[PDB]
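Key idea: predict the complex, not the pieces.
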Amino acid sequence: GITGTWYNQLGSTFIVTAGADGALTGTYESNAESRYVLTGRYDSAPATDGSGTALGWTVAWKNNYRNAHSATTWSGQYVGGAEARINTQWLLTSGTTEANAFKSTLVGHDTFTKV
Amino acid sequence: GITGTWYNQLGSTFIVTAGADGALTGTYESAVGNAESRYVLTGRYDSAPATDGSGTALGWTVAWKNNYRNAHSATTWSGQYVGGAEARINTQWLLTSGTTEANAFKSTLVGHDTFTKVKP
Amino acid sequence: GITGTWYNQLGSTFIVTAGADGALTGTYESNAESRYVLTGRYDSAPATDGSGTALGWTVAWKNNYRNAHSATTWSGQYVGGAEARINTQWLLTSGTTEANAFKSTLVGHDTFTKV
Amino acid sequence: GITGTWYNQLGSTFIVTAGADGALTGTYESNAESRYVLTGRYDSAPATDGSGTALGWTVAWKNNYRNAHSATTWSGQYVGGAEARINTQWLLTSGTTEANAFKSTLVGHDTFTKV
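Result:
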């Protein structure tokens, strides 16, 4: 159920392939200037008790056209079914000097759907 | 640089290779939790950091499943590498477990890790 | 604005009083055994540009009937408007031995509405 | 054991009184320009098995001299002993417009000592 195209509410889009041995590979877009490589991992043998599938992935926001000197990680779970969704929490860290490290990391949450 | 063997404050080991293309590949062995042996890791880093003394942003994921066991969970580390006298990588991390919908509210642990090239 | 009775996504009720110089006082429930004291602070002089009102509160999960040996803090902002809402992120810390400190804190998010 | 003056390792000072009712009251200094009111809660009946004591507190960064339109919540635990410490994770939320509301919260950590 994970392989495919996913959308959040802010428009953004991500296309992933969930390989056989837990790999997650794909791209994240918000045009070419807006596409970034993603890579992650997921639990390739989840429970069957009704639990979701744990996964995670990272995007460093540099492509051949841009560099924000930052990286986001999303940690969450795939919830299959008719309203399949991926519920995540994320951390965005920015390259900062030591003096400003205390405010280098933003936290938030995102839900992705197939629609 | 980032490539090498790193240790966190708890004795966990992170062996990583920083590719040319912003890719991070390696292995992680955790000292704590529902873990055993090495786990595959993958991530990304900024391969063209700023000059001003800023650190290098990076992140990576481990799904806690190998041939020995499966914890049904995954951890993502988000942070930055700071080179120099004592090189170090400072991170914040999110550990998400597979749960049913009713317990999704308690599925995610949050913490911070410091990695260094010398074992503590 | 902030003063009154609020509800989250899950059926918990939060009754607050917002005081003239930034105190937040009240109770958090989910009967009496599920009733706990909260306290916090808010920006008593927000921006007039459209931004929300920053706030936070804490609940320790001890009352006369129960003690879970833990505390939750909510960090967020009130938004006045169509549906007045409080959007938050929370941290729940459990008292642990230092061997288990790594697993002591959960993170999540909640949205409160007067409905 | 919590009542007292506490220092983090970046020049900040927390003076707190822990009340018999589970209340935390005090001052956070980062000068009188730099003094802010804090309020929180803690477990007034913790375990005596070596587990720490859960607590939290909030500072809204408004005083009579300045206003950052922001608030920090600290979630953590007190650990007694020779080298007593309070280990925390915090959330700093800023007042933002609706569209910037995703970049509104910073996450970090703090350790305080009686030094």
